[model samples]
Target chain A: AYTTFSQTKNDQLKEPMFFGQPVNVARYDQQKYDIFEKLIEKQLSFFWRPEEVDVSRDRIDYQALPEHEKHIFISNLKYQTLLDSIQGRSPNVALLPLISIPELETWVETWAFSETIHSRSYTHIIRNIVNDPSVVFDDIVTNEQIQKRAEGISSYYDELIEMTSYWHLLGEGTHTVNGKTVTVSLRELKKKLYLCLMSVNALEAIRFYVSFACSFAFAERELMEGNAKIIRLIARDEALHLTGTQHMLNLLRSGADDPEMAEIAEECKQECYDLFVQAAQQEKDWADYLFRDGSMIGLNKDILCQYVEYITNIRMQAVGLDLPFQTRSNPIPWINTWLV
Target chain B: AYTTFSQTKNDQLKEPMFFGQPVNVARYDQQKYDIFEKLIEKQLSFFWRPEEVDVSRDRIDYQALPEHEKHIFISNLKYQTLLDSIQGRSPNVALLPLISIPELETWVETWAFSETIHSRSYTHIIRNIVNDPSVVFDDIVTNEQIQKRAEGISSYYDELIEMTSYWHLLGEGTHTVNGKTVTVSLRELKKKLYLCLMSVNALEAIRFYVSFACSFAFAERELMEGNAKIIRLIARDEALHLTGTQHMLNLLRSGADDPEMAEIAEECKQECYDLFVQAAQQEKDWADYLFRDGSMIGLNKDILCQYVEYITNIRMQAVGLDLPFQTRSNPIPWINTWLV
Candidate 1:
């Protein structure tokens, strides 16, 4: 049902962003939405290597930090690693088979590829700080606090991927499979995709921002400046990623690309609102984990939680979801110095 | 049955290259196979954008060329476009869900992302020489000669993806789906993956080299030098991609990664040999179509076919396949000047 190159030569400018024809020719001469082409151009122009930033100085700085400060830094890096580990592959695995237009298809591949650079940056940052890198990488799965968020973040992508497999295999029907009845519906799969993108938006727009505050806060204290340079590059790339998903969600809801998708967006409204709120709360709880021993000089639990609310309200409104929290000013305006 | 992020903290160094526990952490501090990590680094060092090359002079060169020479240049670009179009998305879609190691997973994404840049280069070149790029891009599907090769190339990826969908949906069992019996076997799927890698290797190894000969042939006469400069960067990247697939195939046959894969390689030896020969033959036939109007000054159908046979023998031996053609020296030695 899903061929690598759909041979039909359909008009790419006329296809929907998702679930039309698989993109046959990856041409960028014309785009249904030029925003994706612009994003791809922006991302390519922003490319940087992790090794390009000298991390030798970071090793010394990390060794001088107190034990509790080390915990806050290492734990924050672990969460950032988990966020990218999912982001790096989920978009390509869960989204590629269903993408229909040429520009958006390439955009998804480019987006996932950038996350991998971020993943490598984590390895770079961790290798310089810790004597045994596995102590941190291996603990990502066994740590109960990290696992809770891992389960929450991965569930959306996993559900979408499973339903995508069913849709591709059995393709929109009820059938008996080993004495059990299974059903696959196209509309249901579309809803799964819509919600998955919302989860992805939260991961990029809110979850990553919270982790970035911790990384930048250390640099604010004149510590780990090399790591800050790398994260600044990653943050710039994440801004492009967040815009990519926001456009996808907004265009689907506008009924401009697929009218049925607009209906699907309407159907998933309350669920989408709750998904964002739950993610913001999880970030707040994650802040608790970061500062359990003590608080950093410029960032802590209460301030970080308020920043989560601040970003969450802005991100939700961007995609037309009703705001869940009262508006608040930026808690750590100094972080923008690094983000820009 | 497939989750984007697996929660188990499995030792990545112990996992097979494919079909093991899903990689929960995107750590590159260590790798089961360091070759993939090295490939990712080389690829990152080779990043490029299409806009950096100035092809304005090619517009003048293209206009002054005879009609038959124009045919050769545009046809070669179109074929190059087709190859990148398939490569840009196929690797990520078909391979990411099954990869177990972090380094190999990122290599695949990095590989696919590079192909998207190639795809963008085609649009850049086409938009420059021709007033309406759609006249060339739209004909990619409708053209009979191109469609023939497109089908030949896409079939291997299509078969693997279909079998993958079934294996993921109904795990290695015979099931009744709408009163139809569907059998899914892991061993058979492994064979499909093996043969697909063979197909992909030939694509980067044999098929692309043939097109490069044509692209570089024009530059030997000091014509279309700008286009040649872009193809030079592409060829360097293709060297990395071909090495990647070759390493994968050789490792699978070595019994080091998965013993069953070694057995599968033994069982599918003849089928793998025939796949390469068939791909070589398709490239030969494509050479005929490229010159049917009239042969260019430096390249013709007979010489191109000889080059195809010569390159095929070396590529096949790299993966332990028996040679299908008589060995010969380099037919066009000057091509090496551009390739390096």
Candidate 2:
């Protein structure tokens, strides 16, 4: 039922962002959503190479750090690496088949491709500091603290991919597969897409923001300034990604495109609020892990935890979910200096 | 079956290019296929915006053209738009779920995103030339000539995608799906992937080059030079894409990654050779259609047809297929001037 290029020449302006008709021509002169085209253009404008940044001073700064500081830094870097490793491929694999418009299709592909550049930057940062980068790359899966974070992050994309496969293959039916009955429905799949975007919203806004604070905290002092520079670029790109998901969530809930999606979004509101809080809770625990040894100069577990609640409330409310936490001002205002 | 990110950690360098395990880490520190990594880098370096090229002058040139010349220009642009439209999305949707290695996975996504820029360029070029760009973009689906080409191009991708959905959902062996017994085998799926990549190789190597000749021929007379400049940028990217598929085909046939792929490649050579011939024949037929009204100076149906046979033989041998056409000197050496 799904095709790479659907032969039907339908009006793209009339199509929904997802699951209408597969985009026949990738035209950008007009769009059902102009925001995606702007995002694509902005992302293309902001392209940078990891090698372009000189991490020479970072390698030296990393070597001179105390063992405890190194633990905090390396573990945070590992988590960010794993996050991007998933982000880089998931959007394309999970969302490409379901997208029904040109601008949105290209935006998803462009967003995922940029994450690869971020992933490459992590390798650049890791390779410079450690004698054996493989140990760091390999440990991302085995390290209990890091692996725990990877679990929830991958779960959203994995569930969506599985449901999408059934939707595309069996397509809205209760089917017997390997002696077990499994149901796949378009409404249920649409709910999965809404929740997955919420998870992605948290990943980009809250979880990545938590990691951003750690990177900037080291730069808050005078250590790892070059790594901070690269992360700043990544952070700039993340803001755009956060906006992309926020738009998807808002547009669906507004019932602008798919009326059923609006119903699905309304049904998933509690689940969506819970998803952000769960991620915020995860980040707070991740904060505990990062600061297990000791606190850094300007940032620690308490401040980072407060920052998580602060960002999570804003992100959830942006998509029309009721705020799950008390509103508060920035916990780490100084980190903004390194955000770029 | 297919997760956007696999939680299981494995040495990515040890994974095959496709169908081992989905890549969890988007690390670029190392690669099983370095060419993919280099292709990613080159594509990123070769980044461009279609608006960067000044096509303002082409509107006047297009207006001054004879009706037959105008027909050739609009038809070729429409056909090019359709090709990029297919390419911009197909690689991401069809190939992403099956890719196992990090570099290759990212390369396919990166490759598709760049093609989106090419797709955008068509809109930019089309808008400047005529009042209603919709007629041209609209006709791409209804035009019998263009649809015929899109058929062969999208069929290979459609087949791979259908087979892939089954392979991912049901690992292997015969199963009843929707009251129909169907067999899914990894070996047969691998064969589909191989044949699809060959058609893609022919697409980049032969089909696009024929269109390139038509676009460049107009610029040889110093008319529609702005359109020529944009096509040149598209051609530059196509070279990298052509090399990418060439390497995949060679590596698969060489038995380096999967020993089963080598046997599959050997068994599929005749089918691969026949597919190339069919595409080449279609391009020749398309040339006839383009010139049915009248031929533009320096290029006609006869000249374009010889170019097809000439390129078909050369591109066929690049991946170990026996040549099927008579070898000859280049028919239009001046087209090389437009190829960056």
Candidate 3:
């Protein structure tokens, strides 16, 4: 029974990682990892409502844009819709049952909840910029380029969820199901979790920053500043989110909580690096499609690809990866003004 | 694979209720039920932050209260802590996996997320009012009066969660585990959900109103009006929450979504009535403990108990529950000023 307060005679909740007693009380007086509490405080302090930013001016700016610039803006918006659509629900669905701490559990929910607000903001932005929001929202699923990228992202989550269902239903062992032996082990589950986190990091760190560059590029030309303002707020929140994932990775790799997880991290390091590089490649292909018709003033295929390499290296370093991409200066320095 | 946008050409989400195919798209353009969409709109329109209200003057007002009045204020604060503590996590943990629609899935997360904000506001209020916040917060688990109520509120959630875990893990069947027979059935799970929702309704409708009376009682005597201001904002949000649950119950009972749920509601009507009456009785006991030392000018145990009965009848009728107590006009009608 999940009590608001667990009055058990002993404090046996000091188990490692995922398979501990479920968290009972929502107390922040103590924490297994204080970093989560800090993240929560930062997120709450950065509270914002999409309605607080007026996108009424974007209606006029969008209409005045050249054809190619319109393509760039709308495509980036579509990609964002896809990103948040997955993010707003996947974390809670994937991670909630495994979490053992109240603070971290709430943090996961808060993080997902904030993404939903961002998702709603997309609908709000799209409604104002176009006469029919369906023209943009519907194409998100049917568009071939977006569909390819969606496959790359959803595959990791789907595997993790499927494995989780099996593990929770039938405990780790060889089981004859439909006259076939299926082997499940704790190590295998942990490996899935580690890889899932890496994929999510690549998504948040690389994919989102690439999108942010496009959003800020319009503001560099002093158009869509209202939309850029909301993106800036979102970027600030994303920084905390990136920090959160980085902390989780560092904690597991350092063996602060679970020693076996550190072993898994070591074994998966190459696979993790390959995942980031593969995502960077997918994003570059996405840039090619975005500028297929033409290019915008401050942003085009080449600059976005350069930004991708620049961000991939920085994000890789945050998780202790030796920078794989060649170090390069930001292609569009003025975009920093919008982000900062 | 669950994509941010599913490009899959299939419409297999037509199964009734839980254990259906997972939702593929988050299009609110259509729904099996519109009540969820209406609830989301209402919740969005009611968006608020505790920081928006300036409660700095509350520090001075709190310092000026006599010793007994200080007990009244801080005890009320602690009770709010317990209430929000259960609310902030229960809905997500209990309801999310059972939700079959995308809109309802998002609503359950959104509702739980808002309650976390309410939880944070308590810490903010308590930190401003007291030197050692631990003295108030730590006692919440140890306090006899609060602990008694916590058990009752959490058991329904715990039962629902256990049954959900078993159903999700083992599926519906009679299983022998450790020489015990466990029967898992969809009908029984749905009945548990109905009872759980009723328990949640009683918490929001009856229990919250009782707490609000204590808060507004301070304002009635022209004392701690700043604290009262924060509570008033919370009260407004609670009104929406109450409406959301009430709508859920009404829709289910009216056979709008599932006829089985409607039948369950009818079968569980007496149980639902008992849930409310039991909560009312507990709140009255809590009032006796709050006024144990001495009664403040505008509020006392007897009057608070009377207020509990009055509000219980109104809430009962709203959810189609038979009123158990003789209906009486609100003894503290002036409290309506603060609520509005």
Candidate 4:
């Protein structure tokens, strides 16, 4: 039984991560991993509510848009809905069962809960921008372009969850299920975890940035600034979230915390590389779809694609992944003005 | 794979209450259960932050108090610290692993995260009330009285967690481990969960209210109004938390979502009765310890003990527990004047 303070235990929580005795106390005063503590502080400092930002004018701005521009705006909104929708539940659902530390467990919940607030903000934005939010929200699942990416994003989590369920429910050994023998092992579970975190990094690091560019572009034209304001808050929160995944990946790869995770990281380096590149390519494809019919004044598919590569390189380097894309300048430089 | 919205696949989420199928999507337009949606609405309406309440005057109030009164005040604060400390993490750690529904999972995290803010508020209050915040914060673990109750509250959570981990890590079976044959069963896990929820309800119902009485007593004398103001906000949130657990218990009893849970509830009814009674008795003993040296003008051991019974009966009735304590009016009715 874990206490807030484990008085009877002499367990050193600072011992190497993953497979160590689980963290006994949720202590912020000290940390075995300072990154989580920093992320918590950053998250707490970025506390916000969607209601604090006024979106009253978005109703008028959304109405004034040209037919194709309206498509551009709402489609981006739909795509965002899908992203946060998966995000709000995935971390806790997929990663939590594998976590062995108290801080990381709390951090996962905090991270996921923040995404729920972001999800709520989307509802707030959609409700304000359109008379029928159901039209937009409903289309998020039914839309072909959005659904394609949703499957791509969910695939890694689904694989990890499936393997984890089997590993956790059935201990390491060859087990017969429905006439087929399945071999489950901790090493395989760790590899799945490494790949899962990499996929999460790609989502946080690249996918969200692509969406933010669209939101900020609208704000740049002084249109839908209320929605943009909320997105900015979401973006600030996402920065901390992205940092959280980066720290986890870096820690796991360095072998400073878990030597076995380091081996898994090395063994799965190509898989990790493929995961990021695949997500980046998918985001580029999404950009093409977002701008296929027409282009917004400040953002176009070509420019959004460039920003994706820029972000992809930065994200890859953050996790010690060699950059696969050129270090090009941001396609839309003014987007940076809105980001900070 | 769970999307943010519904899909065409007509998959029923007929998994175990916690570790069953991943929730397919978050659609409040439809619910497998309505209780969680109601809890979400109630919690959102009760949204607040610690920074919103001013505690500057609490510093002055602290300096003016007699030494024993200061001891009483800080000790009560310490106990609140322990309660929120356990509450801030335990619900997510112990409960999140079992939550299968998207709405309920999100609500659990939202509820737990809010408690962490409340925990931070204590640090904020303690910092204002005393020059050295560490003196009080540090004592929360070292002090015997606080630690004793902390042990009692956390042990149930710990046991529930251990059982949950065992059940998740190794499915129900008899296995030889270290020369001992351990039998794991879902029935045993459900009982542990039922009792854990009862233990949590007792902490929120009985323990927090006892601390509120002490906080309000200070404000009754027109002192520490700022601290009282914050506690009122805390109380407002706690009201929602109390409602959450009540709904969970009622839902289980009704077999609205899971029929097996109803059977578990029936089997654990007597145990739940003893859990509440045991917690109430513990609080009564704590009241005696609080007033061992002396009692204040507005509060005393007898009044606090009566408050314990008054609260325990009300709480027990809320969750279908038979009112075990004798009928009694609020011994110190004026305490409500400050609490409300």
Give the least accurate 10-residue stretch of model 4 chain A, judged by summed lDDT. A1-10
The per-residue C-alpha lDDT of model 4 at residue B152 equals: 81
- Evaluate fnat for each of the predicted models and list the values in order: 0.91, 0.73, 0.20, 0.13
The lDDT for every candidate, in the order shown, is 0.91, 0.89, 0.78, 0.77
TM-score of 1: 0.98
Candidate 4, residues B177-235: lDDT per residue as tens digits? Answer: 43446688978888788788888888887789999999999898888888898899898
User: What value does the lDDT take at residue B177 in candidate 2?
Assistant: 71
- What would the per-residue lDDT of candidate 4 be over residues A217-243, giving only the tens digit for each residue? 888889898998898889889888998
Evaluated at residue A29, the lDDT of candidate 4 is: 45
Q: List the residue pairs that clash in candidate 4.
A: B18-B98
Interface RMSD per candidate (angstroms): 0.9, 1.4, 4.4, 5.5
> Cα deviation of B249 in candidate 2 (Å)?
0.4
Winner of 1 and 3 under DockQ: 1
Give candidate 1's root-mean-square deviation (CA, Å): 1.1
How do the residues A107-150 of candidate 2 rate in per-residue lDDT, one tens digit apiece? 99999989989998998889988899888988887898888788
- Distance from true location, Cα of A88 in model 4, Å: 2.0
Q: Which 10-residue span in candidate 1 chain B carries the lowest summed lDDT?
A: B169-178
Measure candidate 4: CA RMSD. 4.6
